[PDB]
């Protein structure tokens, strides 16, 4: 009936910021109920967030109300989430579904998010340089 798409997973260091988001497609947000869960290596998922149309009453998993923020666009099908104060716990598969109840079906594709310290390697050998070239 509905199904959801979620992505834009990155790699940041404990203590960072990480924009992800789901481009839903069957409904609309300022309408029905959403929420963004995680699921880290096998675990069994687990709802993160939770955002409700109208008035703006949210609710997390209670461990994640000062970790993470779940919002979304009343005209725009996307469901966003900031990923900060990070602890080795975010490292892991993100999805956003609606609420039907009390729990996540989660039909989004996976958003491979992960946490690690000193990655700021990309191979260049060529200097990066800055803005002293623009060719």
């Known amino acids: 009936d509905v199904q959801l798409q979620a992505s834009g997973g990155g790699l940041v260091q404990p203590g960072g910021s990480l924009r992800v988001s789901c481009a839903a497609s069957?409904?609309?947000?300022?309408?029905?109920?959403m929420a963004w869960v995680r699921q880290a290596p096998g675990k069994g998922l687990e709802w993160v967030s939770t955002?409700?149309?109208?008035?703006?009453?949210?609710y997390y998993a209670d461990s994640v109300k000062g970790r993470f923020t779940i919002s979304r666009d009343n005209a725009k099908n996307t469901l966003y989430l900031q990923m900060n104060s990070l602890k080795s716990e975010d490292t892991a598969v993100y999805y956003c579904?609606?609420?039907?109840?009390?729990?996540?079906?989660?039909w989004g594709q996976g958003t491979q998010v992960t946490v690690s310290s000193q990655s700021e390697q990309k191979l260049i050998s060529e200097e990066d340089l800055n803005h002293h070239h623009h060719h």
């Open positions: 579904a609606k609420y039907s109840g009390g729990a996540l079906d989660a």
């Open positions: 955002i409700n149309p109208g008035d703006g009453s949210t």
């Open positions: 069957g409904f609309t947000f300022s309408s029905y109920h």
